[PDB]
């Protein structure tokens, strides 16, 4: 909804959208091959699909091809010092792709603008909009036009046919917050086909164990997830995809006893498998 959109804000007034209370699939985005630049800081691109986070900040803007490396920790330049700054320990990913055939106008595009001059440095995640005309010489400015008084704002002028370093690229930055808080965005969790009447491991909504799953006759209330025994032992689980009650029986085990006479009388021996049906012995 935010990145299929056809409008991307100016860099000095970039659009920030918060993302929370949902599941994020970054692996499918990474596998798709329609983007020309992808890099991350503080995390590797292959692992986002296994992490949980509290908030996601999505920054959207458009910048020229020869400036894409400015969006990085510990960087200096016109964008890094006048338009958009991120901290040295920024944890997230910067992605950028080709939008030359979608964000250009003949004779230079003036719908998109950037800040050329500013009086001070930009703090990380600091957004400023101003219109006082910049002063650079010994002539009054900041409200009056004189000699060498120039607006502290300039336009790229995205022409329809430019070099790769001047074509408009849509740049999206995902900022990540590892703060201690209940997670709201996580990678999608996957489930496999259920198998019953066999000794098989299970991981039911974080309840992990080993045993045999059978159809049960118990009747949970419609809020309980798993049952327990008298001695606080897991014995039944409600499946999260069928809402079905499954009894858990520990896999058959027992002692092995070797019944034998004296070794000098005979070497013939017998084996007793305690509390084991003979069908499960082999």
């Amino acid at each position: 909804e935010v990145f299929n959109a056809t409008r991307f804000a100016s860099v000095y007034a970039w659009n920030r959208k918060r993302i929370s209370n949902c599941v994020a699939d970054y692996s499918v985005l990474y596998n798709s091959a329609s983007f020309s630049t992808f890099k991350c800081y503080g995390v590797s691109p292959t692992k986002l699909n296994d992490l949980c986070f509290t908030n996601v900040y999505a920054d959207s803007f458009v910048i020229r091809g020869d400036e894409v490396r400015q969006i990085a920790p510990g960087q200096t330049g016109k964008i890094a010092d006048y338009n958009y700054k991120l901290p040295d320990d920024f944890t997230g990913c910067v992605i950028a792709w080709n939008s030359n055939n979608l964000d250009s106008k003949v004779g230079g595009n003036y719908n998109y603008l950037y800040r050329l001059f500013r009086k001070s440095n930009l703090k990380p995640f600091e957004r400023d909009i101003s219109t006082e005309i910049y002063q650079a010489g010994s002539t009054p400015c900041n409200g009056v036009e004189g000699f060498n008084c120039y607006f502290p704002l300039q336009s790229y002028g995205f022409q329809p046919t430019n070099g790769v370093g001047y074509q408009p690229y849509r740049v999206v930055v995902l900022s990540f917050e590892l703060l201690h808080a209940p997670a709201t965005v996580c990678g999608p969790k996957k489930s496999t086909n259920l198998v019953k009447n066999k000794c098989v491991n299970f991981n039911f909504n974080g309840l992990t164990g080993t045993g045999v799953l059978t159809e049960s006759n118990k009747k949970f209330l419609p809020f309980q997830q798993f049952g327990r025994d008298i001695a606080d032992t897991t014995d039944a689980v409600r499946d999260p995809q069928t809402l079905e009650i499954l009894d858990i029986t520990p896999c058959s085990f027992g002692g092995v006893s070797v019944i034998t006479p004296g070794t000098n009388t005979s070497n013939q021996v017998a084996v007793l498998y305690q509390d084991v049906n003979c069908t499960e012995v082999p």
């Epitope: 329609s34 055939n101 979608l102 329809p160």
Partner: antibody
Framework: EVQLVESGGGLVQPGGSLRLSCAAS????????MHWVRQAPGKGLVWVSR????????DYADSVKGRFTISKDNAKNTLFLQMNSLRTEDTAVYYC???????????????????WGRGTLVTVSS | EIVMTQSPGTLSLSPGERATLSCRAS???????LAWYQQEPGQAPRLLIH???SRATGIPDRFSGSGSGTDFTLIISRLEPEDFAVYYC?????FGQGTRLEIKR
């Protein structure tokens, strides 16, 4: 099937105004970027304009800048091209053509036309 | 901005002998993004070739050409009495003047 029906056009004095419409049926009209082109009598096809999926961004050609406006509502399912201050050299037959959208992670228009509708003749003279 | 000049302006050919059509682009940064069309004088242009290499559905195997750089050439293997039409090239923001094919006599 899938066709585009052109409506409007005809005789009009120079310096007037006119409205052209392209009704669509058989395909999801909102999700495809749209194009307008024209063909002069006995001459090659000349491109006119673009429009986005929502219908707010256009890049009207140098021949048609300032006096041509293109609009695309998604509910009524039709495309509009309004012309003002028409001049004599614009006597032609107008077509409306789609733009191939891949429907992928990015819509990513391919700058190509796949279907050509049955257009109308517009004539400007005194 | 881009100009697509098509050469030759008018090509005359027998109903069976083959030929080629060449197009020159002013600014060759298309990266093999090109389209070809064949339009009879009395009906709408029909699509022939996409990406200057592959053919679309319904196009006969005869229509097959390839080109790189500013010189984009489209080849036609054999001829039938249907080439009495105008061939048009297409970039994203430009078009060709058109080349007409005439049966010799």
């Amino acid at each position: 099937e899938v066709q585009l029906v052109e409506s409007g056009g005809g005789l009009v004095q120079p310096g007037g105004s006119l409205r052209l419409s392209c009704a669509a049926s058989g395909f999801t009209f909102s999700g495809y970027w749209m194009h307008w082109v024209r063909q002069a009598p006995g001459k090659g096809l000349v491109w006119v304009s673009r429009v986005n999926r929502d219908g707010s961004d256009a890049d009207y050609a140098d021949s048609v800048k300032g006096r041509f406006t293109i609009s695309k509502d998604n509910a009524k399912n039709t495309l509009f091209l309004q012309m003002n201050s028409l001049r004599t050299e614009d006597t032609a037959v107008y077509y409306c053509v789609r733009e191939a959208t891949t429907f992928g992670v990015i819509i990513m228009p391919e700058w190509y036309f796949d279907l050509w509708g049955r257009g109308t003749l517009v004539t400007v003279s005194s | 901005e881009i100009v697509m000049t098509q050469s030759p302006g008018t090509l005359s050919l027998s109903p069976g002998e083959r030929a080629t059509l060449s197009c020159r682009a002013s600014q060759s940064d298309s990266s093999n993004s090109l389209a070809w069309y064949q339009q009879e004088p009395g009906q709408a242009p029909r699509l022939l070739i996409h990406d200057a290499s592959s053919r679309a559905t319904g196009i006969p195997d005869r229509f097959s050409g390839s080109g790189s750089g500013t010189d984009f050439t489209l080849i036609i293997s054999r001829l039938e009495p249907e080439d009495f039409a105008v061939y048009y090239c297409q970039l994203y923001g430009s078009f060709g003047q058109g080349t007409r094919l005439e049966i010799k006599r």
